[PDB]
C-alpha cells in the first residue's frame, strides 16, 4: 500500500526493508558495495525471531535517481557520511515523503536537516535489535527488532506529527515487528545512549561480546558506572530518565543472547565507527551544561586511539 | 658491604650489575633464568652508559645458599610476597637493609609484617626504562636514577637519614643518580603519576610509549589520568611538585619507544601488578573521600583483560 525506499541497505536497512516487503509493501532498495550481488542473488535473512526470509527478485538500485518516488524513506546508512547521504534522499522522495533515520546517536536529525527540503518530514527511528551483515546478501538477525519512532521536523502541525509517527509505527507492526510512538525523540535518543555508550565502546575496547562483559564483575561495574554518567548527562541536559533505569537495562542485557554490538563489527571490518554521533555529541552537549563524564570521555579517547592505530 | 639481589630481573639485574661493576660484592638470586645466567653471565646493553659484562657472576637458585648480605636489593615483582618474604629473610644479615626496587603504593607496609623488625625496610623509586631481552641480557634504554626512602625498621631519626644516605651513596658510587627522599610515601605517589597511566594504557591499548604520546587522544587521556593521581596524592596529604605531569610528559617524549613492565607481564602471561599500582592508590584515595573515575575504570578494564582466556 505504501512505496518504501531504503537508503543504505545494510544490516538495519536490509532487515526492516525486507520485513516490510514481506508484509506486502512495495519496497525499493538502494545499495552500495553489494548492489550487484543483491540485485542478482536477492536478499535473505537468517533470524532467530522470524526464521529464514527471502526476497527475490528485489527492486534494487545502485543510483538513487533510478528509484521511483517513495512515501517513506528508511535510512539505514551509518551516521558517518551525512553529505554523501543527503542527495540520495531527495532523489527518492515523493512529494512530502517521510524520512526515517534508523540510526543511533544524539543530534542526528538536526545534523541532517539543513540538507533536506522543508517539505520532507524528518523522523528518528530507534531500533532495539541484534543484527549484522553476516554473508554477502545475507542478514543475521539474532534478537529483538522493535523500532520506536519520533518526529523531529517538517511541515506537520502537532496533531499531524502524531498521526505520521503512528502511521510509521503501524507499518512496522503490520510487518510483525514491535513498534511504539515516542512522545519525545530527543528524550528517547538520550535513553538509547545509556545502552550504546557503554556496550558499543567496551565491546571494541575489551574485544568482547555482551555475555563476558556481563559475567565479569569488574566490566559489569564499569558498565553501570558509565550508565550513571550518561543518565547524569541526560539529567543535566533536561531529560530525567526513569528511576533505577541502569538496573533495568543491566538486567535485560543479562537475558540477551551473546552479542557483538554494531560498533564491534564496524571495528573488525575496518569501517568508520560512529563515534561522532554516539560519543562526541553527548560529550559536547554535557560540556555545554557543565556536566563532566570522565569515563565516557576517556572511553571516547581510547576508541579514537584504536581507530587511528595500524 | 655484602650486597644481595632478590629477584634478578631487569631491575635487579641492572642495579646489581652496576653495583658489582663498581667493585661491590653482589650475590644474585635467580629463578627461571638461573641456569642461563650461571653459564653466560650478565650482559648489560645500556643506551645511557654502554656495554658492561659480568662473567662469571655469583648466581644462586635458592636464598638458603646465599651468604648474609648487608644490603638486599629486591627487584622482584609485587605479585608474590608469600614467595618473596622467606627469600629476603634467608639472605638477610643481622640488621640488613632491604631496598624494595618496586612500583606501587603501600608496598613496604604490605611486606613489613613478614620481615623481622630488626631489618631496615626501604623503598627505592626507580625512574628507568629497562627490560630483559634474551636470557642473561639486560636492555637499558633510558634514565636509571633511584631515589631511596625509609619506611620501617629499628633505626632512630638520625640513623634513618644515614641509612637512606648510605644507600644513595652506593648508587652514586656506581655512576647512577640517586637522591635521598625525606618521605617515601610522597615519593611513591610521585612515581605512580607515571606508572598508573602508562602501564595500564600500554596493556589496554596494546601499545608502547611512542604511539601513546604521538596520538592526541591518548596523550590527553594520559594527562587526565595524571591529574587524577596528582589530585589523589594531594587528597591523601602529599602535594606533588607543580607541573609534574608536564615534566613527566617531556621525559617520556625523550624516551625511546618503551613497553612498560606491565606490558611485558601481560604478554608473557605473568600476573599483573594491579594490586600495588591500582588497587592500593584507589583504596587510599577512597579512604580520603577522593574519587579517581578514570583510574577506577582503567583498573576495572585491566582486571577484565587479565581474567579473559
Ligand atoms: N544491530 C545493528 O546493527 C544496529 C542496531 C541499532 C541501530 N543501528 C544503527 O543503524 C545504522 C546502520 O547500522 P548497520 O548495523 O546496519 O551498519 P551497516 O551494516 O554497515 O549498514 C550501513 C549501510 O549503509 C550503506 N551506505 C552508506 N552510505 C551509502 C550511500 N551513499 N549509498 C548507498 N549506501 C550507503 C552502506 O553500504 P556498504 O555496506 O556497501 O558499505 C551499508 O550498506 C547505524 O546508524 C547504527 O547505529 C544498528
Ligand atoms: N624499567 C622497569 O622494568 C621498571 C621500572 C620501574 C619499576 N619497575 C618495577 O620493578 C619491579 C620489577 O620490575 P622488572 O622489570 O625487573 O620485572 P622482571 O623483569 O620480570 O624481574 C622480576 C624478577 O624477579 C623474579 N620474581 C618475580 N616475582 C617474584 C616473586 N614473588 N618472588 C621472587 N621473585 C620474583 C622474577 O623471576 P623470573 O626470572 O622467573 O621471571 C624475575 O627474576 C616491579 O615492581 C616493577 O613495576 C620496573
Ligand atoms: C539493541 C542494540 C544492540 C542495538 C544497537 O544499538 C547497536 O548494536 O549498535
Ligand atoms: C620509569 C618508567 C619508565 C618505568 C615503569 O613504570 C615500568 O616499566 O613499570
PDB file of C-alpha atoms and ligand atoms in Angstrom, chain A residues 7-14 16 30-35 62 75-81 84-85 88 102-105 125-133 192 196 200 259-262 265-266 271 274 278, ligand 1:
ATOM      1  CA  UNK A   7      18.617   4.461   1.536  1.00  0.00           C
ATOM      2  CA  UNK A   8      21.552   2.396   2.759  1.00  0.00           C
ATOM      3  CA  UNK A   9      20.780  -1.321   2.558  1.00  0.00           C
ATOM      4  CA  UNK A  10      22.999  -2.785   5.268  1.00  0.00           C
ATOM      5  CA  UNK A  11      22.033  -4.865   8.275  1.00  0.00           C
ATOM      6  CA  UNK A  12      19.400  -2.413   9.512  1.00  0.00           C
ATOM      7  CA  UNK A  13      18.126  -1.193   6.148  1.00  0.00           C
ATOM      8  CA  UNK A  14      18.130  -4.701   4.717  1.00  0.00           C
ATOM      9  CA  UNK A  16      13.496  -3.584   8.007  1.00  0.00           C
ATOM     10  CA  UNK A  30      19.454   1.487  -2.758  1.00  0.00           C
ATOM     11  CA  UNK A  31      22.682  -0.491  -2.354  1.00  0.00           C
ATOM     12  CA  UNK A  32      26.385   0.339  -2.308  1.00  0.00           C
ATOM     13  CA  UNK A  33      29.073  -2.373  -2.243  1.00  0.00           C
ATOM     14  CA  UNK A  34      26.599  -5.256  -2.506  1.00  0.00           C
ATOM     15  CA  UNK A  35      24.278  -3.901  -5.218  1.00  0.00           C
ATOM     16  CA  UNK A  62      22.614   1.444  -7.443  1.00  0.00           C
ATOM     17  CA  UNK A  75      17.698   5.472   6.078  1.00  0.00           C
ATOM     18  CA  UNK A  76      19.877   2.531   7.083  1.00  0.00           C
ATOM     19  CA  UNK A  77      23.211   4.200   6.369  1.00  0.00           C
ATOM     20  CA  UNK A  78      25.633   4.993   9.148  1.00  0.00           C
ATOM     21  CA  UNK A  79      25.746   8.443  10.726  1.00  0.00           C
ATOM     22  CA  UNK A  80      29.300   8.816   9.393  1.00  0.00           C
ATOM     23  CA  UNK A  81      28.591  10.257   5.936  1.00  0.00           C
ATOM     24  CA  UNK A  84      27.015  11.654   0.965  1.00  0.00           C
ATOM     25  CA  UNK A  85      23.619  10.687   2.419  1.00  0.00           C
ATOM     26  CA  UNK A  88      20.148  10.262  -2.303  1.00  0.00           C
ATOM     27  CA  UNK A 102      17.237   4.180  11.597  1.00  0.00           C
ATOM     28  CA  UNK A 103      20.365   5.397  13.315  1.00  0.00           C
ATOM     29  CA  UNK A 104      21.925   5.532  16.761  1.00  0.00           C
ATOM     30  CA  UNK A 105      23.443   8.542  18.463  1.00  0.00           C
ATOM     31  CA  UNK A 125      13.846   5.500  14.417  1.00  0.00           C
ATOM     32  CA  UNK A 126      15.453   3.951  17.485  1.00  0.00           C
ATOM     33  CA  UNK A 127      15.995   0.271  16.713  1.00  0.00           C
ATOM     34  CA  UNK A 128      16.445  -2.175  19.591  1.00  0.00           C
ATOM     35  CA  UNK A 129      17.756  -5.118  17.590  1.00  0.00           C
ATOM     36  CA  UNK A 130      20.705  -7.502  17.318  1.00  0.00           C
ATOM     37  CA  UNK A 131      21.528  -7.670  13.610  1.00  0.00           C
ATOM     38  CA  UNK A 132      24.570  -7.590  11.358  1.00  0.00           C
ATOM     39  CA  UNK A 133      25.731  -8.186   7.796  1.00  0.00           C
ATOM     40  CA  UNK A 192      19.248   4.772  23.948  1.00  0.00           C
ATOM     41  CA  UNK A 196      25.012   2.166  23.281  1.00  0.00           C
ATOM     42  CA  UNK A 200      29.473  -0.374  21.895  1.00  0.00           C
ATOM     43  CA  UNK A 259      26.042 -10.484  21.008  1.00  0.00           C
ATOM     44  CA  UNK A 260      28.697  -8.332  19.356  1.00  0.00           C
ATOM     45  CA  UNK A 261      27.402  -4.739  19.092  1.00  0.00           C
ATOM     46  CA  UNK A 262      27.209  -2.978  15.741  1.00  0.00           C
ATOM     47  CA  UNK A 265      31.505  -5.407  13.669  1.00  0.00           C
ATOM     48  CA  UNK A 266      32.450  -1.965  12.333  1.00  0.00           C
ATOM     49  CA  UNK A 271      34.672   0.523   8.879  1.00  0.00           C
ATOM     50  CA  UNK A 274      30.028   6.161  14.747  1.00  0.00           C
ATOM     51  CA  UNK A 278      27.401   8.219  19.852  1.00  0.00           C
TER      52      UNK A 278
HETATM   53  N1  LIG C   1      22.199  -4.169  15.409  1.00  0.00           N
HETATM   54  C1  LIG C   1      22.537  -3.088  14.499  1.00  0.00           C
HETATM   55  O1  LIG C   1      23.198  -3.315  13.545  1.00  0.00           O
HETATM   56  C2  LIG C   1      22.007  -1.675  14.786  1.00  0.00           C
HETATM   57  C3  LIG C   1      21.119  -1.538  15.794  1.00  0.00           C
HETATM   58  C4  LIG C   1      20.603  -0.329  16.105  1.00  0.00           C
HETATM   59  C5  LIG C   1      20.984   0.779  15.375  1.00  0.00           C
HETATM   60  N2  LIG C   1      21.871   0.661  14.366  1.00  0.00           N
HETATM   61  C6  LIG C   1      22.221   1.854  13.629  1.00  0.00           C
HETATM   62  O2  LIG C   1      21.774   1.662  12.094  1.00  0.00           O
HETATM   63  C7  LIG C   1      22.612   2.315  11.336  1.00  0.00           C
HETATM   64  C8  LIG C   1      23.290   1.319  10.363  1.00  0.00           C
HETATM   65  O3  LIG C   1      23.899   0.321  11.136  1.00  0.00           O
HETATM   66  P1  LIG C   1      24.256  -1.123  10.433  1.00  0.00           P
HETATM   67  O4  LIG C   1      24.439  -2.156  11.515  1.00  0.00           O
HETATM   68  O5  LIG C   1      23.130  -1.520   9.507  1.00  0.00           O
HETATM   69  O6  LIG C   1      25.655  -0.951   9.593  1.00  0.00           O
HETATM   70  P2  LIG C   1      25.939  -1.498   8.065  1.00  0.00           P
HETATM   71  O7  LIG C   1      25.722  -2.991   8.039  1.00  0.00           O
HETATM   72  O8  LIG C   1      27.355  -1.138   7.683  1.00  0.00           O
HETATM   73  O9  LIG C   1      24.881  -0.775   7.033  1.00  0.00           O
HETATM   74  C9  LIG C   1      25.104   0.549   6.630  1.00  0.00           C
HETATM   75  C10 LIG C   1      24.658   0.643   5.148  1.00  0.00           C
HETATM   76  O10 LIG C   1      24.636   1.882   4.738  1.00  0.00           O
HETATM   77  C11 LIG C   1      25.298   1.833   3.271  1.00  0.00           C
HETATM   78  N3  LIG C   1      25.619   3.162   2.814  1.00  0.00           N
HETATM   79  C12 LIG C   1      26.262   4.145   3.452  1.00  0.00           C
HETATM   80  N4  LIG C   1      26.317   5.194   2.626  1.00  0.00           N
HETATM   81  C13 LIG C   1      25.707   4.862   1.477  1.00  0.00           C
HETATM   82  C14 LIG C   1      25.483   5.556   0.305  1.00  0.00           C
HETATM   83  N5  LIG C   1      25.805   6.888  -0.157  1.00  0.00           N
HETATM   84  N6  LIG C   1      24.838   4.984  -0.700  1.00  0.00           N
HETATM   85  C15 LIG C   1      24.398   3.708  -0.575  1.00  0.00           C
HETATM   86  N7  LIG C   1      24.617   3.026   0.575  1.00  0.00           N
HETATM   87  C16 LIG C   1      25.274   3.606   1.596  1.00  0.00           C
HETATM   88  C17 LIG C   1      26.345   1.082   3.471  1.00  0.00           C
HETATM   89  O11 LIG C   1      26.871   0.474   2.215  1.00  0.00           O
HETATM   90  P3  LIG C   1      28.060  -0.674   2.316  1.00  0.00           P
HETATM   91  O12 LIG C   1      27.616  -1.918   3.091  1.00  0.00           O
HETATM   92  O13 LIG C   1      28.407  -1.050   0.900  1.00  0.00           O
HETATM   93  O14 LIG C   1      29.273  -0.044   2.952  1.00  0.00           O
HETATM   94  C18 LIG C   1      25.715  -0.058   4.277  1.00  0.00           C
HETATM   95  O15 LIG C   1      25.121  -0.912   3.403  1.00  0.00           O
HETATM   96  C19 LIG C   1      23.679   2.892  12.289  1.00  0.00           C
HETATM   97  O16 LIG C   1      23.440   4.214  12.482  1.00  0.00           O
HETATM   98  C20 LIG C   1      23.505   2.091  13.595  1.00  0.00           C
HETATM   99  O17 LIG C   1      23.924   2.911  14.770  1.00  0.00           O
HETATM  100  C21 LIG C   1      22.394  -0.558  14.056  1.00  0.00           C
END
